[PDB]
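Input:
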Amino acid sequence: MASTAVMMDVDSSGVNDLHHSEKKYAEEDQVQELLKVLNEISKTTLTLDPRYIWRSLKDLSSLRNQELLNAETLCFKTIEVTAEINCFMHLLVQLFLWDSKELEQLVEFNRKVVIPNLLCYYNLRSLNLINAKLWFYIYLSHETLARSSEEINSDNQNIILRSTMMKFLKIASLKHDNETKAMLINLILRDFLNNGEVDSASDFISKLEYPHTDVSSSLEARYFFYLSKINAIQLDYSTANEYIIAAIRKAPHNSKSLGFLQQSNKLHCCIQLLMGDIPELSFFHQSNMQKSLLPYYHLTKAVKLGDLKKFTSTITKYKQLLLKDDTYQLCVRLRSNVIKTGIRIISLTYKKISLRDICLKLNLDSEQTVEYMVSRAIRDGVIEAKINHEDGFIETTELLNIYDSEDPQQVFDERIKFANQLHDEYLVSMRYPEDKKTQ
Amino acid sequence: NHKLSESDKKSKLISLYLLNLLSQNNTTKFHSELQYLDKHIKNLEDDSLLSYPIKLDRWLMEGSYQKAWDLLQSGSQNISEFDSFTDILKSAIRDEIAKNTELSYDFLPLSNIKALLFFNNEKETEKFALERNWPIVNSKVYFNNQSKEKADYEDEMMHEEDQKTNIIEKAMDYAISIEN
Amino acid sequence: EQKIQETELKIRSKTENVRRLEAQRNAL
Amino acid sequence: QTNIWEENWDDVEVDDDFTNELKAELDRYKRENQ
Amino acid sequence: ILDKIFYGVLDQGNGWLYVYETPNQDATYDSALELVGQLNKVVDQLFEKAS
Amino acid sequence: YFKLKKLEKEYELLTLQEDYIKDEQRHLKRELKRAQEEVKRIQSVPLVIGQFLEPIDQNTGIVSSTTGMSYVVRILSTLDRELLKPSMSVALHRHSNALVDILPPDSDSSISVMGENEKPDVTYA
Amino acid sequence: NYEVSEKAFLLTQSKVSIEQRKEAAEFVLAKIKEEEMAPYYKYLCEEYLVNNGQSDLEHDEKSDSLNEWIKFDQELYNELCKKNESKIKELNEKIQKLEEDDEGELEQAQAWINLGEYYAQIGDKDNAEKTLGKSLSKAISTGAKIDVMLTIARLGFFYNDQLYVKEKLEAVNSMIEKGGDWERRNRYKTYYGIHCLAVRNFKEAAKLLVDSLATFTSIELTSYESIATYASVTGLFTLERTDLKSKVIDSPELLSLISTTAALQSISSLTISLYASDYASYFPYLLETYANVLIPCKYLNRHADFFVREMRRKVYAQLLESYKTLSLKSMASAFGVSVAFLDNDLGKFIPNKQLNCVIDRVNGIVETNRPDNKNAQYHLLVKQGDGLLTKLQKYGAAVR
Amino acid sequence: VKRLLHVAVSDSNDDVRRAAVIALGFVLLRDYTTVPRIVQLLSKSHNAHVRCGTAFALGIACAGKGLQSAIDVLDPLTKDPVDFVRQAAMIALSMILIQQTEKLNPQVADINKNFLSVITNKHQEGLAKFGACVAQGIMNAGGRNVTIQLENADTGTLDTKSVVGLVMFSQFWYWFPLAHFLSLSFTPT
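Output:
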């Protein structure tokens, strides 16, 4: 029972014992695997009263009991080292709100776990056995504050934490000191997304991606996730989406697809908006609103027309939901964009239309702001036309070519450049059986 | 947490300073500061001074400045302390429009452009356009070349005919060669 | 120090495309 | 929204055919006016 | 022409039969996209088949 | 710092040890590709005719000769199985005497042939 | 079942005429007397309910209902329950005797089928299936599996239902590929050309639906004009000038039923009238076709505007392909219609983009666009690989 | 080495390669270590001479050493169709295998047998049998109680003389009256 609970952890420690003698890939991925199966046993009734007794005994095990806080009494230096650390890993696991509610207790514990005899020698030894999420995933909760008077001061524990993560960013020595890292960024990112202005993300950019391989595509996507949101008000759209496009593409998430990928999708949906593309939410009908899309759809629904009021109405309606996702900042722009979009379409299809007939769409809307409004539109390209008011003729271009240009062959080049994608990758993985079969 | 103190023109300040940032013509940072902002709309809408740049940006970003250019002329903060960028912005406004006119118009009556520039003297305009170095005959701003085409760099790639292609060949040949 | 240390990891990591080409020599 | 429709584009819109027929009258009726 | 029995197009504003002529191209991407269709499918299947 | 000096140092050898190989390969690459060539040119025209009888196994089989010779020989490593065709007029080296290739079906022997009008000239009516 | 489900549909569609209402449940009101239709005629009286289906002796009787024929009585049920039980009791020991005597294999399944088909008459979507299952359990013949087809077809198409039946239609036809030798492929493609006609068929079984005829129809699941009508319109509205002017140009099939039903008068009729390359004539013929065709029939209505504007658009292709240079004025003006409004939805085809039409509002003039080297051929190329590339990214997304 | 490699690797003439391959195990002497892993590359070749050249340089570096690993590399090459090839492999291994025998190394028996096998085999060549009988007597040289040493960890120091006999004997089926040079590295236990 607690036995079997312990027995599982015995296997974990037994697999920790694998890593203990130089064997992570087993251990970590097992620990990874263990992290999931961790939900099973969970709790910590006799698992720990039997753990703190099974392993060995250490001062910190005592200070850990301050987190335990209970009564058992009863009767009943090596193996009890990183196991204890690996259990401090599970300590954090005992903190999930699994076996906890207020980790603000555990906050200090975390430090008092993190900082002492830990966050010390571990550079290549601990391999992302740090979970700074599960470090912060704790603090994540409490950042429901509100309450804290943030934090302490303002809010320095987080500033500290940032600096502490910074204190890791040093510790990210790239000795392999990586994996967990840009969660730190991601934290800081979402910390920006909490308050700060990401743009130092550019510095965070400037450092790195979570290099590289063994990082969870999840994070690597979650990397992109915020990293998308960089370009959000960085107002790069593709790349933002490309992140999403590199995030949802192969980030592995079903359980976490649920609330969390919606988020992704939300901004993702928000992307094509940035481009005014309005894909068919005909899919985004599905696994969406419910709780995510449909305002986006309403947006799309509006953005299909981009009818400012009807547009605004959605916003008018969903602003809080927007506000809930802070996609509100968006769309304030695509308003006239779609207006200008329509302006472009089923309309520019003459080599003109007039001033006033194209002004008619503005005679539908406004006048001689047209001049601006058209220049407003022409300004961006995003249409191609000309005018002369001296002509009063809003002169709407071809947009007509052939592939005479290198334009296709650009794409061919684009295709060409990709010729190495799977081709060079085949060699990227050629190794593994081929090389391990030698073993 | 800073309810500890708080103050009012703090709004005006950033308002000015966003409008500054706005005049400073750094868009994302401008907006990402709105993003940076702790309470945005709660703050924002509650400040006309903050409500200029946004509504402006609406006007601004895509390029119709009509009321905006008027709005700031009417702006109580422009009326209060802000006129610093107001004029700055006006230019900064029109340079876009200048390109927009450029885009929109090969040729434009030196009237219309001025009318677009909200100028009174067209020599006002004329300077710009010729500062812009715009082909101009009587009464009319022209764009014979609306753009910068050629002008040195961005070469050796993106329009190297076989060269790239050959490089690409060479590349693909290295996709053939690095194929080891 | 640890300077000297993970310098290996490069070589450590290097070890490999090698062994592909090993398979490649075979494969050839 | 139901289960499986013909799907996309999207539902587009509606109230056209008759609106057209209204004008298919009118247009033609206008053309009858013509 | 409507049946492409002939190659030309009508000028309304002009009132003319505007020039036109027969060919278009060779079926290639046509030929290609087939594979471009073909592959992933069996492969994604295979890609799955490994997973 | 130190035992690396012992330890660490030794691994540039591996670095090197790695390094050599591609070289060998590229050669070997070329090696095939140059060797690969005549492998084709093994085939050549001045061949003889026979009738494929039957494979003993892949790149083996009994066939016929226009001399009636039937012997264990080789065949296309070009073909395989579904590629291999169980009775064929065939292509044989004289001396190497092996199957160079099938002959797409022969026709005109005796018998005394067949009627062949390919696109007859007669319209009816 | 057929008229049932349609006179269901008809009145459940009742919009235009009280007769659309009236004529439909008219029979039904007698047909519920014909067959004990209540249990679905029950929900069928909840079908069109909450519009005009709101007047019933059991479910709902409301004045906003223009249909009171969506009424019942419990006698219907007593009658039914009697009928049903009668039917039931009959087959009960009969089938039980079919069980008792171990009597027949399909002959056992026979009174099962009878048991089942009641539910068709009854409007029971239940035992008939289980009955069919226990018919099919007794099925030693793909002909009994044919009856599965029938059954499942009577199942879904009694409600004009969807997938499971179609899936069954697959499943039932999947067993032996025979297809009732020549035929049940018909029923397959028929019902399939109805299944897929939900709401689509569009290109898909429209052909198939056009193709085989009249090689079956069903009575209770369909009439023959039905497919003809249905087959035509979609295949029509979908397929090629050539095809249509190869096929619906006419068929003895057509030639038989041409105007025989007037239940058309339009479909390709006014469309080949369109295909005559009209402008104005066909412009009514649409809605003339529409309300005479689309609103009338199950999917024909349910799809609605798929049809509407494409042929609307379509001709313009012709009209374009005629003219490089066409004055939209000469079009929209000289075609005696709303220029602008025409132009508007026509302009709504700019974003639908199926216009090569290069078109003016002001000068009211139309021009063309062309595939050239771009085509889609050298055009589409981009994405096609991309998706692969994605899957290829997906490919490498495996690794481990 | 790297030069020598490609030089060997690239070159037209085999024995060049072969010898060059052979010559490796000298500049490679001090580490026999990867030499098997190294010649593992050339353990495989289209070419025997390659696979010939392999045997020595490897058989050289471990002559006074171990690595059945290195050895066992060559055992298929002891079966490499050409007796001349394996003839080396015979010798080459036996160069390693004096004093090492008997369940310390069991396979020696086979090896010795394989000699005898070959030596008995009438269809194994006097390429094979030659080397075998030699490789046999190699293991048996100086009443089999004597060893083969170079860069002697005893001293830590090279012996040029230890080298020479090999290099001398290197060309032999070229010039048969040679091998007596091999007596150099003979070393007392």
